[PDB]
Design an enzyme around this catalytic site. Structure first.
Site, PDB file in Angstrom:
ATOM      1  N   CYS A 166      45.341 -48.271  -1.507  1.00  0.00           N
ATOM      2  CA  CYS A 166      46.018 -48.279  -2.537  1.00  0.00           C
ATOM      3  C   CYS A 166      46.215 -46.869  -3.045  1.00  0.00           C
ATOM      4  O   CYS A 166      45.332 -45.901  -2.955  1.00  0.00           O
ATOM      5  CB  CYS A 166      45.295 -49.286  -3.609  1.00  0.00           C
ATOM      6  SG  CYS A 166      44.617 -50.939  -2.993  1.00  0.00           S
ATOM      7  N   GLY A 203      41.354 -49.272   0.715  1.00  0.00           N
ATOM      8  CA  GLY A 203      41.107 -47.951   0.538  1.00  0.00           C
ATOM      9  C   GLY A 203      42.774 -47.441   0.589  1.00  0.00           C
ATOM     10  O   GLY A 203      42.935 -45.915   0.282  1.00  0.00           O
ATOM     11  N   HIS A 227      43.559 -50.512 -11.107  1.00  0.00           N
ATOM     12  CA  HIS A 227      42.467 -51.185 -10.408  1.00  0.00           C
ATOM     13  C   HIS A 227      41.302 -50.469  -9.938  1.00  0.00           C
ATOM     14  O   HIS A 227      40.084 -50.624  -9.482  1.00  0.00           O
ATOM     15  CB  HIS A 227      42.901 -52.386  -9.558  1.00  0.00           C
ATOM     16  CG  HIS A 227      43.186 -51.989  -8.264  1.00  0.00           C
ATOM     17  ND1 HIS A 227      44.509 -52.201  -7.837  1.00  0.00           N
ATOM     18  CD2 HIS A 227      42.595 -51.504  -7.236  1.00  0.00           C
ATOM     19  CE1 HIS A 227      44.572 -51.947  -6.594  1.00  0.00           C
ATOM     20  NE2 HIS A 227      43.328 -51.150  -6.258  1.00  0.00           N
TER      21      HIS A 227
HETATM   22  O1  LIG Z   1      44.344 -55.582  -1.834  1.00  0.00           O
HETATM   23  C1  LIG Z   1      43.907 -54.618  -1.965  1.00  0.00           C
HETATM   24  C2  LIG Z   1      43.217 -54.188  -3.311  1.00  0.00           C
HETATM   25  C3  LIG Z   1      43.231 -55.180  -4.309  1.00  0.00           C
HETATM   26  C4  LIG Z   1      42.460 -56.136  -4.200  1.00  0.00           C
HETATM   27  C5  LIG Z   1      42.686 -57.294  -5.107  1.00  0.00           C
HETATM   28  C6  LIG Z   1      43.569 -57.233  -6.279  1.00  0.00           C
HETATM   29  C7  LIG Z   1      44.524 -56.030  -6.185  1.00  0.00           C
HETATM   30 CL1  LIG Z   1      45.226 -55.681  -7.764  1.00  0.00          CL
HETATM   31  C8  LIG Z   1      44.044 -54.890  -5.215  1.00  0.00           C
HETATM   32  N1  LIG Z   1      43.961 -53.432  -1.031  1.00  0.00           N
HETATM   33  C9  LIG Z   1      44.309 -53.909   0.244  1.00  0.00           C
HETATM   34  N2  LIG Z   1      45.646 -53.338   0.755  1.00  0.00           N
HETATM   35  C10 LIG Z   1      45.548 -53.863   1.997  1.00  0.00           C
HETATM   36  N3  LIG Z   1      44.238 -54.237   2.363  1.00  0.00           N
HETATM   37  C11 LIG Z   1      43.839 -54.706   3.594  1.00  0.00           C
HETATM   38  C12 LIG Z   1      42.443 -55.083   3.620  1.00  0.00           C
HETATM   39  C13 LIG Z   1      41.721 -55.092   2.710  1.00  0.00           C
HETATM   40  C14 LIG Z   1      42.302 -54.772   1.348  1.00  0.00           C
HETATM   41  C15 LIG Z   1      43.538 -54.424   1.277  1.00  0.00           C
END
Ligand SMILES: O=C(Cc1cccc(Cl)c1)Nc1ncn2ccccc12
Ligand SMILES: O=C(Cc1cccc(Cl)c1)Nc1ncn2ccccc12
Lengths: 304, 304
Positions: free
Chosen positions: A145, A143, A41
């Protein structure tokens, strides 16, 4: 003595963290040998996440669009490929800090350490478990990921998780290092609900053995039970059914303490039926299920 | 989202761990520049620990009696000195992996990460706090002495603790990196009891702010209190008295959530008086006090 939620030392994994930027998105990548692994992604804009066709989005990307920085120096990308939900960016330089490693796909109930990272830099390390509903209860911000989960056996790092997503319920979903999600999750911004987060019974029993080893013994009772009787109680309390495979894995902890696995099951049964009555076990007021029998032995024996 | 007991990445500290052997005793040492720091009880036999005169025991030791091994290679000891309860072994080689560092003496209530080590090799990393009674609730086995506690600010490691001892109650005592014990403990095998382990009120409040930020809000009530009224309740429950210095430190968390510090105190007061009623906050069934306000902001903002 003392029993802590302990993570593996993170040095070997810190040496692998890099930043990956594509277009305006930046996340973490894992640099092992001459390959950088990261969530696919990274090629998406925030709008693309609603319904992305990754194969189509990737056609518009060339090697030079993937900016990979290790510390403060840029890596040259000489190839790129998509394997399931991860991108593999071939670079022209092997990571000199590549530890001995393996990619493993873990089962629910298994624990691992997470090195949370932002912009290719480590922020912290914590211990967690693959839940029976295939989510993880992590601590991740935007960020994060590309941050990875791993176990270590002496000098070999077994990578088991790469962070991809937070569900609307604040729990986390991700892939193994082959890009396959744990559970039914997809890398799409669509509300995906997690199933029942049942308790990892064999881990609770291991933690009860750890408590006896560390002096907390108030919960030990004069009773015993059978696997079938115990499992009726486990079903009632949303605990995973205990099998003879679980009993076998608890053998060393049973031998160490002289407490038969079925007797410990009867202690757990009474704790489930009666509650803790305001008391604590290993500084916890609830039954902890994110320590495996292997974790308890390792911590209680000092494996390095 | 999600909130975990998170330790600092341990790589910078792993690069400093060495094994120190004197006679038949082996423990860990911390190699920074050309000096190796370790507990002075490395010169004692198990019999010596009953009533040791360290100055007299050290007269019988020469540089060549201190065996220091970094990984699988031996360091040459060219000087030795005792500073309070630590030995400083001057070696002929500066540690090439010496990070930017400082030695700090922390106050009770402050948290740090511990890299538990055995034979100069890291076993794990966990987060803990200097208790108000100057003990730490760690996880340490025989041979773990010399393992250190530390904090990290970007690239600077602030070493704050060196493990020396386990008290009969399974809690741990140790020194800062100048060899001074925290609290009244002495490196002698004599039963030393710890004082009241009171709860770190400002940390519980910070953790309640972390819970609101991460979605757990059931405990927020319609009440407020004063510092004096809150402190009457804190005294009753063996909590540390809250001062205006604590209220000031909670300012950023108060601003982030829009919840005045005294209103959060009133929520904490009701939780103390009524209990959790079988409910949980951030996956805990008790009030957590080993996250400082700085830790909560750091974790909730992703400082690397
Ligand atoms: O969720 C995502 C990125 C994302 C968004 C939509 C689909 C996919 Cl496959 C991946 N990152 C993330 N991990 C903890 N987070 C805490 C606050 C914001 C974002 C966040
Ligand atoms: O307590 C000591 C060493 C010691 C003994 C007597 C006096 C002094 Cl100053 C130091 N190490 C330790 N730490 C955790 N442990 C867990 C099981 C056994 C030992 C142990």
């Amino acid at each position: 003595s003392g029993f802590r939620k302990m993570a593996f030392p993170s040095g070997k994994v810190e040496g692998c963290m890099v930043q990956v930027t594509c277009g305006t998105t930046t996340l973490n990548g894992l640099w092992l040998d001459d390959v950088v692994y990261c969530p696919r992604h990274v090629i998406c804009t925030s709008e693309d996440m609603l319904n992305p066709n990754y194969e189509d989005l990737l056609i518009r990307k060339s090697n030079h669009n993937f900016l990979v920085q290790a510390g403060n120096v840029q890596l040259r990308v000489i190839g790129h490929s998509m394997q399931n939900c991860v991108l593999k960016l071939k670079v022209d330089t092997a990571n000199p800090k590549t530890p001995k490693y393996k990619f493993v796909r873990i089962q629910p109930g298994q624990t691992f350490s997470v090195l949370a990272c932002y912009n290719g830099s480590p922020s912290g390390v914590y211990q967690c478990a693959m839940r029976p509903n295939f989510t993880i209860k992590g601590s991740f911000l935007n960020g994060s990921c590309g941050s990875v989960g791993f176990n270590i056996d002496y000098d070999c790092v077994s990578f088991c998780y790469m962070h991809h997503m937070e569900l609307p319920t604040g729990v986390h979903a991700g892939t193994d290092l082959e890009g396959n999600f744990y559970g039914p999750f997809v890398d799409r911004q669509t509300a995906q609900a997690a199933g029942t987060d049942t308790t990892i019974t064999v881990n609770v029993l291991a933690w009860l053995y750890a408590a006896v080893i560390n002096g907390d013994r108030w919960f030990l009772n004069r009773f015993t039970t059978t696997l079938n009787d115990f499992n009726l109680v486990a079903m009632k309390y949303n605990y995973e059914p205990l099998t003879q495979d679980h009993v076998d894995i608890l053998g060393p902890l049973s031998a160490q303490t002289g407490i038969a696995v079925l007797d410990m099951c009867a202690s757990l049964k009474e704790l489930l039926q009666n509650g803790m009555n305001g008391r604590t076990i290993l500084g916890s007021a609830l039954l902890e299920d994110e320590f495996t029998p292997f974790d308890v032995v390792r911590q209680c024996s000092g494996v390095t």
